[PDB]
User: Fold Tumor necrosis factor alpha-induced protein 8-like protein 1 from Danio rerio.
Amino acid sequence: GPKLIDDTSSEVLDELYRVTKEYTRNRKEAQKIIKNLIKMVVKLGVLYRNGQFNNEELALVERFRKKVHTLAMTAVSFYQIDFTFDRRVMSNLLNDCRELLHQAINRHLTAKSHARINHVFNHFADCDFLATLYGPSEVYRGHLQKICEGVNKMLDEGNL
Ligand SMILES: CCCCCCCC/C=C\CCCCCCCC(=O)O[C@H](COC(=O)CCCCCCCCCCCCCCC)COP(=O)(O)OCCN
Assistant:
């Protein structure tokens, strides 16, 4: 079949894995978080690109795409412009995405997918994780720079 996640996305996902592993010091858990994120992105993409959503689900998915776009733009801007980062804004955007994803797949998928969604967002939407990622530490700042470079390319190309 075709490759469903491109190289730029894979680099972003790897950097998200690296900050998650730095934050938790649990390589297995960090791998599980990132694999669950990938699995849900792939499932959502298969249903979306092959026209499997009904009208209500499609409204939810388009809302999800708009929220993700806002999240991506905000994440990049909070990295670029000093003294603008707000962990509550990021956490709230992420939890909006979580809820819309739960709703979009509620008819197609089961509790296992809801658990994958919650496992991912419980980590990434955590306010202390976000404040550490955007904080003064050199390791986090270097990874965040790579994340934002990749996200900016995805935004520019139209994939976020
Ligand atoms: C602060 C750290 C938090 C980040 C981690 C949690 C955030 C996860 C939330 C959202 C990320 C998932 C977004 C995928 C949305 C998929 C919906 C749908 O399948 O989109 C379709 C597929 O399009 C895509 O490009 C897929 C989207 C990218 C997939 C790979 C993304 C990996 C995750 C990157 C990081 C997420 C953003 C981070 C923002 C801080 C639309 O297709 P099209 O534009 O019509 O044409 C074909 C595209 N070449």
Q: What stands out?
A: The chain has one domain: 1-160. DSSP finds seven helices and no strands in the chain. The helical segments are 7-24, 27-49, 55-80, 87-104, 111-124, 127-133, 138-157.
